[PDB]
Design a protein around this ligand. Structure first.
Ligand SMILES: Nc1ncnc2c1ncn2[C@@H]1O[C@H](COP(=O)(O)OP(=O)(O)OP(=O)(O)O)[C@@H](O)[C@H]1O
Ligand SMILES: Nc1ncnc2c1ncn2[C@@H]1O[C@H](COP(=O)(O)OP(=O)(O)O)[C@@H](O)[C@H]1O
Ligand code: VO4
Lengths: 740, 130, 942
């Protein structure tokens, strides 16, 4: 397990542990094989049930009811339906933070099963009820099978020197596959320096790196010299040649050959077969990340000059880990998947060292309030970590974290690294002076890392955990005419898609109105798209009836439509990436229906009925055009200019279809809530004269995004907050507004 | 390069009196470069056929730029006729509306039933006379 | 090898005494060649800037020791701002250096050519004396500006005397030094002061000198002094803002980061002449000033982003890393990098990186940077191949290793050669993430550079400052109106491929606004006087730059936005009648239609005038419009009109980019011989620069008539931006002469990145611009002349006959629109059908000529001619608008023609018209009478 895990991704380790647990279970003495239970676990969704679903005491959702009725097929599980509705603490267990620790006894067994039997029973119950905790329960099952601390080696930082010197033969190359944003050249350079062995580092390319690499390899086999070839994934043919040459050299002992390369499918399979593979990723969890950072930093560099340096380095490592593994929750954490890596941490270390040495020349025990907090915060927010930050919201999040951590109050005793992780349990600042104190404090961190540590909501991992569990089950399971259909689908699509919508009448008085101009352009673009898609679908129907011939364009359209890929011609408005054709068609139908309603409203009134209508910004080609049109209409109504205008939104022009991501509004103020989304019914967009006055403390700026993928900012709303709330908490929680 | 080789082989004269001009050996005779399947040439990664751009340049501007001396060569007694297929034919790609301006298009369809009957009827009556 | 030595051993007289033993032993091969190369590299090592010059240029330079005037061209590319050197009357003693803008830096200590005859040594001494002279003049200027520092109510006359006394870079340096010293002294005086606020005196001094400059720029000023003033306001407004920020934040001591973060200068002429008097310092980053004559260049409005960029670049240089600004195009990357490289006063070379830069080229460039110590900004670095990015990661790691070795005359491994490395080195790579034609960077290289996100420049402050500097008294309100106007125009207008509303757009608008203001001042003076309406000047600039690229459905939107942002004022097009009469004359000479306003051919005249405007504003132009919109004629007629209106000839080279391989377009560099052969564009540019035939006195107009894709136009990013410079893999840098315009006649910019769209002023030639009646009139005018005298008369009276059928709403137009309503195998293009029709009518005239020749007696008469022509016209319409369609489409067009015509037609009711030809006598004869039922021979069948 350890040797294979050294060269495989962190997502797939749990599956390998599951398979090894199965192998150990089949190798036991007398305990039952539990083949039926594993069969139901691997494929439980495959069982088809038409109308047998029946909710009990309204305690199970549709998915939960389907799961429990599917799982009732197992003979020990015949009484699930009656037993769950006869239990009262089951409701408390369902919404428990960690139900994996305690699973109520529900399965009926004639004889007391072995503890592994109880473990697999609990695994089935967890899969049926709490798919989010499926990873935790699988971890518990692996623990009960292979013993505790079985896959605890993966948490420890990898020891390069011992593995290279013992587990690697000279002929076999050492392969360091690196995910994007990570490079293994630095670690092995440090290894070579530590061993005091001269090493040849060469980057592959330019047709001269090949000759240099060949010469270095020829010299190194008779001398024990180490050799590095960096970014060797751009010359696969030369890499075939390298494998063929390396198969037979019988080189000198202590000789090694390192091949730095990225993870792409264009690397040869035979080289991967013939070499030891090492994969470098962001370590999982804050604990392992702290451990890796502390191992990376030399001991001599810490505990040199003032004793506050160790606490500064611990704060730096905590900040680095927090921002590093917030990247996992990209839609809700950092809006973009940045590349906070090892160079960022090295630059942070260098700046901290230089500024601490400048602020304290020789003298130790510098006062906490004399450390250059402002210098470090600005350098970390504007030059090292903020350099890769593009949008202003991510920049303000980085400023929030830097101001929360890098401060004099961090040297107190009651300073909290995390505001709240359980609502009452707060991560306390370790009262350490020397490095080993902070290191051991890291090592006693509990194994219950929730996203609430990060500032993100506690329920920000449900979807990701369930997806990982489904992927784990799919991996484990993998381990063990179109013409008539297109005819039917095209007919159904043409049926559901409405007919062409009418334009808007161009009059002398309506042409001047900005709202009318915007709506005319909208309906014109919608009509063009509707006509194009309707004639394309009609052409598909005619061809699938066989009467019409085949065109290159028609061939391409059919080929990309049978696969569920949205045609590129139909992609005229901004859409979330990578949906199926059916979802796009439903969205288009809703958009065209709204456009027809707009046309009817304009027909009822040329201008008087164009202001008092409600528009869902989710379905609209260019929402910023709508915002600009409302601004222009308000500016033209009065004598006010466009610039002397600011937007104030009152949640009840009328705007519908908006949803808040984790905020409940009472009247117009905001209060933080644990709900994933909160609907905004009939928001009003009011433009008022700009007063050039600084906003109040309770006022915060929430971005408004078009869809779930926060990748297209529409406009920003300044919301006020209710009593006893902190705008910093709003910013760190990633509250936003979604049109879709 | 195909057209360049064709001109080098048949249009030897690359003479440059008061300007570089390209003409065939056989004086007093024009030259028709019958380019067949003109729309088969693949377009670049950015949707642009190179030889089509060359033809448009050497037809509209009436010449090209030779790579040997970067000098303008003007066509003399040279003309182009192409033969192609409908765009809906698989493997075919439409030409740029910029090239079409200098070349009129004529559509030749398959001979109709009566047309085939009469055309090959004459052939059969000629053959069976043996 | 042998041919090389044979060619190069028979040159000038003294050129052959350069290690002449090979010359005598020639008139073996490897030894001679390597000895010559060793001599070249020795001379290059003697004077580091020789690693920027070519080997042939260097050999000619050494051969031309006696003649110094012929050597006054390589100084432009050896140095940064040096373009000429001032010698004595006897051509023996150099007295100083002259920039290309006519600015002189007289050497404090002249050096004589006779007193050091070798080229390299006297060049080294003139470089050193230039640095020494700049240092001494900076010291004198700082001493002078001390007086303004310790005085209030300063005298404008002496202040302007100081400004035009010294060079521009020295003036800005003195201003910054004085401000830094004053603020440092004030902060030291405050110390732990509870209420002492003497820095308000510094703020008041900045205020009063800024007011003096504002008054001085409102009136007529000399050119160089005008630019010095513009720079000085740009710096002093930043100083004012920084001082206000310091006052608001209430900084007590000079060691606070709120003062340490901002760049501050430290001057002390006490130390020796090692040229270390200046100590430019960012946050804990100590920088020396590598005194070199930059000349007079533009200064950016140090904005909040331009500061963050300064901070990050200085930090990267402190860590001895490189800087990698990244973000959207036109966000101030290559100009901020350059502006910071000139703030420290160091030689900065910008290279436009493309995939043709091989490993040896990068190594040679890096060797030159090592020897000279000059900075390097590699524009569009990601445009290299990924393999080559990985390959040059090694060189970056070697060069940075030499800088890290300096920390412990340093040599680094660069192309199996050990080269001296100076600490002033810098390597910068600007890149555009997520853009077409760009390759991703390896993590190995990406960790060798420090990157920042230059995504959104602060255009409001950029505008307000550039204006305030121009002389607009309400610059604040103007910027507050124009920047939101741009941001609302970006949203309200329809998305188009040629639409650009970024910083490059705002910049072109504000420069045009300044020029318009100057012209209006001149016009008013031809009849102080500062009651101008500024809003209408801005409207004129916007309408002269933004309008020429709007589509026909966007102009109302833009004008409504302008009327809403600027309520109360409007601009009317300049008459330009002195050009319009010339346009009318030349259009008449070219059989093209001319009009004014709502006449026929009026929109086309508006577009050619807009093209003239863009020619005046931009140096790169781009014509976007459907094929057959009059783009080619617009610039042809404009060139022919300007060569008469102004008297300067205009020569246009038309190059098709995609026709030939880009290797032939730009050039090739064989990796073995390392010889550069000019491509097509490079050859033309070199011919223009080397005005042997007076090419610099002609209005050269290079036009790229083809398709724009992000592969070749990206090689022109450096020629179409402020750099006006062409950078080659050979290292050669070709400046764009001011009399050259790079044009691109395209039909669409769909396959183009925003980078090229941002430059090259857009002119949108809509299809409605060239009306069909104009095409008809062109044909008829060409028919009434250009004999295909007797033949000319046959064409004339034929045109007289066909005149009624070519009405704007005549038969041909209706037939054409109906044909566009039908279906064709290929998409119907108007100019294709019209070309076929015109060709067939020309053939009709040839048929008349043939018939007239065939019958010398009884010549073909007018009634017969009119019958024949009026039938051949219908025949031609049918065979031009439906020669590409299937049979029943031809029948449909024939039926439409029959029901909407008055020309006599065949009377048979069933057979379609197309089955009829037109006999030379003028009768609609059937075609089924020319199909003999022949009988093939019994052999050779099929
Ligand atoms: N003002 C005018 N009066 C009459 N005819 C004109 C005028 N301007 C252009 N034309 C005619 O229009 C036709 C096409 O013009 P031109 O070649 O300039 O178009 P274009 O858009 O540049 O075409 P392409 O993109 O294919 O190069 C020619 O027949 C030309 O003579
Ligand atoms: N602070 C500034 N003040 C004035 N003009 C500026 C400023 N920053 C950038 N510009 C102008 O904006 C344009 C940006 O060009 P450049 O920096 O080459 O673009 P890119 O960001 O793509 O490298 C130039 O015209 C430059 O002079
Ligand atoms: O980033 V650019 O200077 O090629 O527009």
């Amino acid at each position: 397990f350890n040797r294979v895990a050294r060269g495989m991704l962190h997502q797939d380790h749990i599956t390998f542990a599951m398979l090894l647990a199965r192998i150990k279970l089949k190798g036991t003495v007398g305990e039952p094989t539990y083949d039926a239970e594993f069969q139901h676990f691997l494929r439980g969704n495959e069982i088809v049930l038409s109308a047998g679903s029946t909710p009990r005491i309204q305690g199970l959702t549709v998915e939960q009811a389907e799961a429990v009725v599917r799982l009732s097929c197992l003979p020990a599980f015949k009484d699930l339906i009656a037993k769950v509705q006869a239990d009262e603490q089951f409701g408390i267990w369902l919404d428990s933070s960690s139900p994996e620790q305690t699973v109520p006894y529900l399965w009926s067994e004639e004889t007391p099963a072995t503890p592994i039997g109880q473990a697999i029973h609990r695994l089935l119950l967890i899969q049926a009820f709490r798919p989010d905790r499926l990873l935790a329960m699988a971890h518990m099952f692996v623990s009960t099978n292979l013993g505790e601390s079985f896959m605890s080696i993966m948490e420890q930082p990898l020891d390069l020197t011992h593995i290279v010197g013992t587990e690697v033969k000279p002929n076999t190359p050492v392969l360091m596959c690196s995910v994007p944003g990570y490079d293994a050249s630095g670690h092995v350079e440090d290894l070579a320096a530590e061993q005091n062995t001269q090493i040849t580092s060469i980057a592959i390319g330019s047709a001269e790196g090949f000759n240099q690499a060949d010469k270095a390899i020829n010299t190194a086999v008779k001398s024990g010299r180490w050799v590095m070839l960096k970014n060797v994934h751009l010359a696969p043919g030369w890499l075939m040649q390298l494998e063929k040459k390396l198969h037979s050299l019988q080189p000198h002992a202590c000789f090694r050959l390192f091949l730095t390369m990225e993870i792409n499918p264009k690397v040869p399979v035979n080289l991967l077969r013939a070499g030891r593979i090492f994969v470098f990723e962001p370590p999982p969890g804050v604990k392992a990340n702290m451990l890796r950072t502390f191992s990376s930093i030399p001991v001599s560099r810490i505990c040199k000059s003032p004793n506050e340096r160790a606490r500064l380095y611990f704060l730096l490592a905590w900040f680095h880990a927090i921002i590093q593994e917030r990247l996992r929750y990209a839609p809700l954490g950092w809006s973009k998947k940045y590349e906070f890596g090892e160079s960022d941490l090295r630059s942070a270390c260098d700046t901290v060292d230089t500024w601490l040495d400048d602020t304290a020349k020789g003298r130790q025990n510098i006062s906490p309030d004399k450390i250059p907090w402002s210098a470090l915060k600005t350098l970390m927010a504007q030059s090292i970590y903020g350099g890769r930050v593009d949008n202003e919201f991510d920049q303000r999040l980085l400023n929030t974290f830097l101001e929360r951590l890098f401060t004099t109050r961090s040297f107190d005793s009651e300073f909290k690294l995390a505001c709240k992780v359980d609502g009452h349990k707060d991560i306390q600042m370790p009262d350490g002076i020397r490095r080993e104190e902070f290191v051991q404090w890291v090592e006693l961190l509990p194994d219950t890392q929730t996203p609430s540590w990060l500032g993100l909501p506690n329920n920000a991992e449900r979807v990701l955990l369930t997806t990982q569990g489904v992927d784990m089950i799919s991996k484990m399971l993998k381990m063990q005419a179109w013409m008539r259909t297109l005819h039917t689908t095209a007919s159904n699509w043409l049926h559901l898609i409405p007919q062409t919508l009418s334009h808007l009448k161009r009059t002398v008085e309506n042409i001047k109105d900005p709202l009318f101009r915007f709506f005319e352009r909208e309906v014109k673009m919608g009509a063009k798209l509707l006509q194009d898609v309707r004639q394309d679908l009609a052409d598909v129907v005619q061809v699938c009836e066989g009467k019409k011939k085949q065109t290159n364009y028609l061939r391409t359209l059919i080929n990309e439509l049978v696969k569920g890929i949205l045609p590129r011609s139909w992609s005229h408005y901004t859409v979330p990436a990578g949906m199926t054709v059916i979802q796009w068609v439903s969205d288009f139908s809703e958009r065209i229906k709204q456009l027809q309603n707009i046309s009817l409203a304009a027909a009822s009134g040329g201008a008087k009925e164009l202001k008092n209508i409600h528009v869902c910004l989710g379905g609209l080609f260019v929402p910023e055009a709508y915002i600009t049109a409302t601004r222009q209409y308000v500016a033209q109504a009065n004598s006010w200019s466009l610039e002397e205008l600011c937007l104030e939104v009152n949640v009840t022009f009328g705007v519908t279809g908006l949803k808040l991501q984790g905020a409940t509004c009472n009247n117009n103020k905001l209060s933080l809530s644990n709900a994933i989304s909160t609907a905004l019914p009939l928001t009003q967009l009011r433009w008022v004269k700009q007063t050039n006055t600084e906003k109040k403390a309770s006022v915060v700026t929430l971005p408004v995004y078009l869809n779930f993928t926060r990748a297209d900012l529409i406009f920003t709303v300044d919301f006020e907050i209710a009593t006893k709330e902190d705008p910093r908490s709003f910013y760190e929680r990633g509250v936003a507004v979604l049109c879709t | 390069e195909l057209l360049l080789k064709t001109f080098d082989h048949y249009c030897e004269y690359r003479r440059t009196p008061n300007g570089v001009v390209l003409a065939p050996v056989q004086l007093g005779k024009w030259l028709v470069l019958f380019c067949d399947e003109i729309n088969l040439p693949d377009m670049d990664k950015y949707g642009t056929q190179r030889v089509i751009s060359f033809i448009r340049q050497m037809v509209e501007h009436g010449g090209f730029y030779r790579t040997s001396d970067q000098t303008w060569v003007k066509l003399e007694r040279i003309q182009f006729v192409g033969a192609c297929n409908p765009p809906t034919d698989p493997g075919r790609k439409p030409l740029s509306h910029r090239f079409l301006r200098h070349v009129p298009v004529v559509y030749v369809d398959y001979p109709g039933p009566a047309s085939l009957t009469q055309i090959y009827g004459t052939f059969n009556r000629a053959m069976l006379r043996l | 090898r042998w041919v090389y030595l044979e060619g190069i051993f028979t040159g000038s007289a003294d050129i052959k005494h350069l290690l002449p033993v090979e010359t005598q032993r020639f008139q073996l091969l490897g030894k001679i060649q390597k000895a010559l190369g060793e001599y070249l590299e020795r001379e290059r090592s003697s004077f580091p800037r020789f690693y920027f010059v070519g080997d042939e240029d260097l050999l000619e330079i050494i051969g031309n020791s006696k003649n110094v005037a012929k050597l006054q061209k390589h100084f432009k590319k050896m140095f940064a701002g040096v373009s000429s050197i001032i010698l004595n009357e006897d051509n023996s003693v150099v007295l100083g250096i002259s920039s290309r803008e006519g600015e002189e830096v007289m050497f404090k200590t002249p050096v004589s050519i006779t007193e050091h005859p070798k080229i390299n040594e006297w060049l080294t001494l003139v470089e050193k004396e230039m640095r020494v002279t700049l240092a001494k003049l900076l010291a004198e200027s700082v001493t002078e500006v001390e007086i303004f520092g310790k005085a209030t109510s300063i005298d404008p006359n002496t202040y302007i005397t100081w400004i035009d006394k010294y060079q521009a870079q020295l003036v800005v340096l003195s201003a910054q030094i004085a401000w830094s010293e004053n603020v440092e002294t004030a902060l030291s005086s405050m110390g732990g002061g509870g209420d002492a606020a003497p820095l308000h005196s510094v703020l008041s001094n900045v205020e009063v000198t800024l007011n003096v400059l504002a008054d001085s720029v409102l009136m007529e000023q000399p050119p160089l002094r005008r630019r010095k003033l513009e720079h000085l306001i740009t710096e002093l407004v930043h100083q004012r803002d920084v001082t206000r920020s310091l006052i608001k934040s209430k900084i007590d001591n000079a060691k606070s980061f709120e003062w340490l973060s901002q760049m501050r200068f430290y001057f002390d002429p006490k130390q020796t002449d090692v040229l270390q008097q200046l100590s430019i310092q960012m946050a804990n980053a100590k920088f020396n000033y590598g005194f070199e004559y930059l000349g007079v260049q533009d200064k950016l409005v140090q904005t909040p982003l331009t500061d963050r960029c300064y901070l990050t670049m200085t930090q990267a240089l402190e860590a001895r890393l490189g800087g990698s600004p990244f973000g959207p195009a036109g966000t101030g990357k290559t100009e901020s990098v350059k502006a910071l490289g000139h703030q420290l006063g160091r030689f900065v070379l910008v290279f436009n990186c493309d995939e043709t830069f091989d490993f040896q080229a990068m190594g040679r460039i890096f060797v030159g940077l090592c020897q000279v110590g000059a900075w390097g900004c590699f524009d569009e670095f990601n445009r290299l191949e990924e393999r080559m990015l990985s390959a040059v990661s090694q060189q970056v790691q070697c060069i940075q290793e030499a800088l890290r070795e300096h920390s412990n005359p340093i040599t680094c491994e660069l192309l199996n050669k050990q080269v001296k490395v100076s600490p002033d080195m810098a390597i910068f790579i600007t890149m555009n993430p997520g853009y077409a034609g760009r390759s991703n960077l390896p993590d190995n290289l990406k960790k060798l550079f420090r990157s920042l996100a230059m995504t959104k420049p602060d255009r409001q402050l950029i505008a307000q400052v550039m204006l305030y500097s121009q002389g607009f008294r309400t610059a604040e309100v103007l910027a507050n109106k124009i920047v939101p106007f741009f941001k609302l125009c970006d949203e309200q207008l329809s998305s188009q491929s040629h639409y650009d509303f970024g910083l490059r757009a705002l910049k072109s608008v504000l420069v045009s606004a300044g020029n318009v203001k100057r012209e209006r001042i001149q016009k008013i003076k031809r009849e102080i006087a500062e009651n101008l309406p500024e809003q209408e000047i801005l409207i004129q600039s916007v309408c002269e730059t933004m309008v020429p690229k709007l589509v026909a459905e966007d102009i109302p939107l833009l004008f409504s936005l302008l009327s809403d942002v600027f309520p109360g004022v409007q601009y009317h097009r300049g008459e330009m009648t002195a050009l319009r009469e010339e346009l009318k004359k030349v259009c008449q000479e070219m059989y093209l239609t001319y009009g004014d306003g709502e006449e026929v051919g009026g929109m086309w005249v508006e577009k050619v005038l807009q093209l003239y405007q863009i020619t005046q504003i931009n140096h790169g132009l781009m014509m976007v419009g459907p094929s057959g919109s009059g783009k080619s004629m617009a610039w042809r007629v404009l060139l022919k009109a300007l060569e008469r209106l102004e008297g300067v000839e205009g020569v246009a080279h038309i190059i098709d980019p995609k026709a030939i391989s880009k290797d032939h377009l730009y050039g090739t560099l064989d990796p073995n011989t390392r010889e550069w052969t000019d491509g097509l564009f490079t050859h033309v540019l070199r011919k223009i620069i080397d005005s042997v035939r007076g090419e610099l006195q002609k209005r050269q107009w290079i036009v790229f008539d083809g398709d724009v894709d992000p592969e070749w136009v990206e090689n022109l990013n450096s020629v179409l931006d402020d750099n006006k410079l062409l950078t080659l893999p050979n290292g050669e840098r070709l400046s764009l002469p001011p009399n050259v315009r790079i044009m691109f006649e395209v039909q669409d910019l769909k396959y183009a990145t925003l980078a090229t769209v941002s430059r090259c002023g857009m002119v949108w030639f809509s299809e409605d611009v060239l009306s069909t009646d104009m095409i008809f009139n062109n044909f008829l005018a060409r028919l009434r002349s250009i004999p295909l005298s007797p033949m000319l008369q046959i064409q004339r009276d034929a045109a007289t006959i066909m005149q009624p059928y070519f009405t704007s709403n005549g038969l041909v137009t209706k037939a054409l629109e109906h044909a566009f309503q039908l279906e064709h195998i290929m998409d119907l293009t108007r100019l294709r059908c019209l070309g076929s029709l015109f060709s067939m009518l020309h053939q009709a005239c040839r048929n008349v000529a043939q018939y007239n020749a065939n019958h010398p007696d009884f010549p073909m008469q007018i009634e017969q001619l009119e019958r024949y022509i009026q039938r051949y016209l219908v025949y031609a319409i049918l065979w031009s608008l439906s020669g590409d369609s299937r049979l029943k489409m031809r029948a449909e067009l024939g039926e439409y023609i029959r029901r909407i015509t008055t020309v006599p037609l065949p009377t048979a009711p069933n057979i379609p018209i197309i089955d009829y030809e037109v006999s030379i006598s003028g009768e609609w004869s059937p075609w089924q009478a020319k199909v003999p039922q022949i009988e093939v021979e019994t052999h050779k069948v099929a």
